[PDB]
A paper describes a structure:
The archetypal cofactor-free oxidase is uricase (urate oxidase or rasburicase, UOX), a long-investigated, therapeutically important (commercialized as Elitek in the US and Fasturtec in Europe), tetrameric 133 kDa enzyme that catalyzes the O2-mediated degradation of uric acid (UA) to 5-hydroxyisourate (5-HIU). A number of oxidases and oxygenases, however, operate in a cofactor-free manner, relying on very limited chemical tools to promote and control O2 chemistry. X-ray crystallography at near-atomic resolution together with in crystallo Raman spectroscopy and QM/MM methods offer unambiguous evidence for a C5-peroxide intermediate in cofactor-free UOX catalysis.
To investigate the reaction steps involving dioxygen in UOX-mediated catalysis, we employed 9-methyl uric acid (MUA) as we reasoned that methyl substitution at position 9 could stabilize the putative peroxide intermediate. Crystallographic analysis at near-atomic resolution showed that under strict anaerobic conditions, MUA binds, as do UA and several inhibitors,[2a, 7] at the interface between two UOX protomers in a 35 Å3 cavity exposed to the solvent on the side of the substrate’s imidazole ring. A combination of hydrogen bonds, salt bridges, and hydrophobic interactions holds the flat MUA in place. A water molecule (W1) is held above the C4=C5 bond at a distance of 3.0 Å from the MUA plane by H-bonds with T57(Oγ1) and N254(Nδ2). An additional water molecule (W2), part of a complex solvent network, interacts with the O8 atom of the substrate. In order to define the vibrational modes responsible for the observed changes, we employed QM/MM methods at the MP2/6-31+G* level of theory. Calculations carried out for the organic species in their protein environment predict a band at 600 cm−1 (experimental 605 cm−1) for the 5-PMUA hydroperoxide (brown trace in Figure 3 c) and a band at 597 cm−1 (experimental 597 cm−1) for the MUA dianion (green). Ring distortions account for the MUA 597 cm−1 band.
Author numbering:
A (entry chain A), B (entry chain A), C (entry chain A), D (entry chain A): 1 to 301
Amino acid sequence: SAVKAARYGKDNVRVYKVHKDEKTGVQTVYEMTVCVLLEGEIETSYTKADNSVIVATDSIKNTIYITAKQNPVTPPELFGSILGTHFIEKYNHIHAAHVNIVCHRWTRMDIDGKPHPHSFIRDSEEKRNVQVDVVEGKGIDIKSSLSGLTVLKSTNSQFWGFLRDEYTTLKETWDRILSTDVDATWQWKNFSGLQEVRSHVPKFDATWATAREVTLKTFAEDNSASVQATMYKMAEQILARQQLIETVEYSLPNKHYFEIDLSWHKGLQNTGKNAEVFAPQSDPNGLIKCTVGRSSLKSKL
Amino acid sequence: SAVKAARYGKDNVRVYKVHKDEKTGVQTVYEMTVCVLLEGEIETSYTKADNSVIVATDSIKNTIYITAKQNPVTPPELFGSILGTHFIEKYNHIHAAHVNIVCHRWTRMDIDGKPHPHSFIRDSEEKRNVQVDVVEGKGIDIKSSLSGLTVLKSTNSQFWGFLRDEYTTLKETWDRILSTDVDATWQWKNFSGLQEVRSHVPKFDATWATAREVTLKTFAEDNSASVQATMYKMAEQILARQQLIETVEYSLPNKHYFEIDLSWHKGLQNTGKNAEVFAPQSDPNGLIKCTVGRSSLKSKL
Amino acid sequence: SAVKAARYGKDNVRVYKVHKDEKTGVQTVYEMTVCVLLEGEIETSYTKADNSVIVATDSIKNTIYITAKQNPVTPPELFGSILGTHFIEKYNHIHAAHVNIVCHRWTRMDIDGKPHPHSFIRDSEEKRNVQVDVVEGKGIDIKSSLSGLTVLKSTNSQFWGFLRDEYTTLKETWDRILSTDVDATWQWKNFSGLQEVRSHVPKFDATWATAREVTLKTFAEDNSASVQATMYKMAEQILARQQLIETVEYSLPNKHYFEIDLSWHKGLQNTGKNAEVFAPQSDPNGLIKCTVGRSSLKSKL
Amino acid sequence: SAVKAARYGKDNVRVYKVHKDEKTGVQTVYEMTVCVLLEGEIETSYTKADNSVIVATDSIKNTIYITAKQNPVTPPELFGSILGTHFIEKYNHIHAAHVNIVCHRWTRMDIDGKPHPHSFIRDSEEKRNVQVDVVEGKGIDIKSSLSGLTVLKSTNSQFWGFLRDEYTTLKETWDRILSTDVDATWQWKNFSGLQEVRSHVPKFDATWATAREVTLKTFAEDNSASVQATMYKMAEQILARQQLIETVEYSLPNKHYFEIDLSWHKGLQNTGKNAEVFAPQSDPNGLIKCTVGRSSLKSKL
Ligand SMILES: Cn1c(=O)[nH]c2c(=O)[nH]c(=O)[nH]c21
Ligand SMILES: Cn1c(=O)[nH]c2c(=O)[nH]c(=O)[nH]c21
Ligand SMILES: Cn1c(=O)[nH]c2c(=O)[nH]c(=O)[nH]c21
Ligand SMILES: Cn1c(=O)[nH]c2c(=O)[nH]c(=O)[nH]c21
């Protein structure tokens, strides 16, 4: 046998950081969960009980906290790049660092209409994430995402014209509920190293904001022909607004809300135009995915 | 043997309702999870295989949807009262109905600064709940609550002066992080029946709002001596603002954030006044409870 | 205002203990999650910021580990009694200790047909629990339970003869799937103190075993008329086999498996006697409860 | 813009099947959760609101149940292959089907030492999984796995000789607890189609059994130098025992159990050779991965 692939490290490292402005009294908090997995010339730890090549996962954990103490933790794309760059530069034999960060929401409370200087609310379980792959000799590849953004619209969703054969029972509809949990990923142009990441720092927060704004507005305003058609519109708009992202990926469940026929009980009318009470379905669910890039076709468009 | 207690019914009944204003186009959505458990002269279903006394749980489920079609689902205190009253009035042999409702957040989206007529966001996993116990001959007992309201403050929390003995290692502190998941319950005066519940309907939304406002403002503004002292202030204020509630209960975890001594690494200073990077602790956690009522002591105050 | 009730302590304290037989090499492991909440003359911590009356929850945590080091952790009824007794005896002003223990399964592995001396498998997420309430001047009240015991039978379950009215759509059945997650609790006679608990120590493991055996055999062998009728049989048998338990409580979901009519597709027959493929339903679910004690009726039986 | 990748279908489809032997009375149950995602000439559903190319996810769901009615559901590798082959053969424009199956445990109960004909217990949340990718013109690629197999050993695990630098605080150990949740995947040689899958059917159950047996025995018996070294031994043995699998992948958390120094309290000795009571750590955790294949090196071995 032989080792074809290997990576190892520390997962589920919870990290908080506070910034305190001593002039104004305003404090700002950041909370994340971090995973760092390393690759390199480590195969003998697996094959020969050679622990000399192992940077202990406990040491990886310590390094996460030390790096957070010595650098900004925001935007996460930058923190992840700093953190991954450290491991490949510090250890000659480590040739890749794979950094995943989940950012948790701590939104400043407004009390009596004024922003509070040091009190925060978890206003959504929506996350902002990064995956930063720092590969020696091949730069820094960053995928940014928002996830767990849960939305519903009560009309202006349709689904008709789909294929019908002997496996088909679904009724066409011209007015349904649409609800989903949005997972949206934008993948950046390869960066050559930390300097180039730093040169684009403002674009990280701005592109996250754009992605979130476009998602919400498109979901709310598109009289949707399908999940497929709506998510494509989101992706194409995000690509149009940031030339440094190469692709946009969406992964959307269709979280079904079923009508309930109550006509068996006193002729109650609760379907079609009279549908008011619905049964949310926990499972099964549609799952719709696509990855959108920029076109390169010049004929047969 | 004999049956000392029994209740049975349907749990985890997911319910959505939409209201559509055909004049304005504005739609409003409600989503809940409902449990109804019945008591009564049902012991022979357990002891004698006598199913004649069982209102099938499937029928309880149907009744939940029928009741939602024929009545408002808001405030939940009212919907639960209507629903429980139905079972004890419809079935001579059913003498109590225990209705639990969890209300899920669907907050209207603002798009380009304007409220959208039919698009919503799950802006928090915070719930608004009711427990409505409708007991034949003994009225309607209602406990209202908010839960899963997760908050953090980065300073203005203290914990010193606690008992110290041979089991004590905890260091006193004059400046710590405080974070919790708020579970707050207000229990109403017994209502005689559905008419009396209806006579107080506006007070349900108003008292929920008061409870939430008081919770947030007190948490943010109290330079806290302990979880105990802060939660008591919340409770006393809520009681002062609604004479129809008899008690207020809080159940608060202390979700610890630990300092991280990094002085072993290059003399990094990350404790006390220089603490910036902390380790959120998933477990264990403090758990602090109290039930506050109005005082009846006249001497030795 | 005034404090009507209060309790506080440490929750989610994970504890492992190992026993090593140095003669045989056989090691045995125990893992639990412990909560201890205290009551007493503690109201001034809430009302007056008086922390002097607070045994810190961190100190409660330390005490859990110290008690586990100095005593057996099995049976959990004994460990909980020792632990609760400590707090009311050590602290004059603490008058009750409420100890909840969840015991996690670590079952010894058999390797090549032989029990391994130090390797274990989590063979089920089924738990064994205790709730031990140690109340100064009122002894020790113990509720023992098993929970998360998930079972299914594919036939020999029925449900017919239930009430039918204008809310009823459920079809009677003479052959259905029955599946549940068993939560079974046996409540012991009040014990006067730790000596009396110790005097009954072997009965704890034996009664847990009896409860589990009776549950499984009754579920498997009863041609069930309803969840109600089957669970009653379980309870009555457990009471007959241990005179020191006063009541037995069951709480059982009915986790529904629905037939799927496929006759719309090529006349496929998948209902009634030809039902093979079913749709497990995640929600809603029946929820059936009862508490059974010994009879005291002498007439009109 | 243009669609670079797309797949869509139905997720979280819960499926039960029963087999009834009418001669013997013995019934056997199977329960799974299935996801099927399709690829093909479907880009116009995203770009042009062309639903004609969409096989509705509801129809995919129906097809899952119909396929389970008309074929064996075991081994899952076979069921997934049948199911994926259907979609690419039935629909000219569908060119890949991606079938994920999670198999849930229903182990036959033994009652009074005899196997019960129709009663089952969920004896572990351990799963048996498959991922079957059926790609038109490129055969059938199958990855089989076991996951959620949770184990602990109380000694015969070590971790010393790891890299030590200015980021290192971890103490070397020659005797620690090791616990993990095993996720093990074996990837099969590409199969040309359903006939070739069928020709190997007995090998699926046999290789799953081998993988599980090797995992347990190696974990129990290896005096482990590291997670890395132990998991490699597992992989190499599985490869030696089934020539039709190309690689074996493990993904193992190191679920840490920390010693607790209690020497501050009455000189209690609970470290090193006297360690009995430990603190299980929920997070962070080591995460160790590798993919092992057969060697092709002929020099510098
Ligand atoms: C309702 N529904 C299905 O059954 N499949 C699909 C699909 O692919 N896309 C939808 O928007 N809805 C839907
Ligand atoms: C830190 N801490 C403990 O250890 N116990 C307690 C308590 O009862 N209350 C607190 O506010 N904090 C705290
Ligand atoms: C199917 N079903 C209901 O709908 N209610 C009930 C009940 O109370 N008990 C059952 O055993 N089954 C059942
Ligand atoms: C304890 N520990 C670390 O900190 N890293 C590692 C590792 O890579 N492998 C281990 O087996 N243990 C371990």
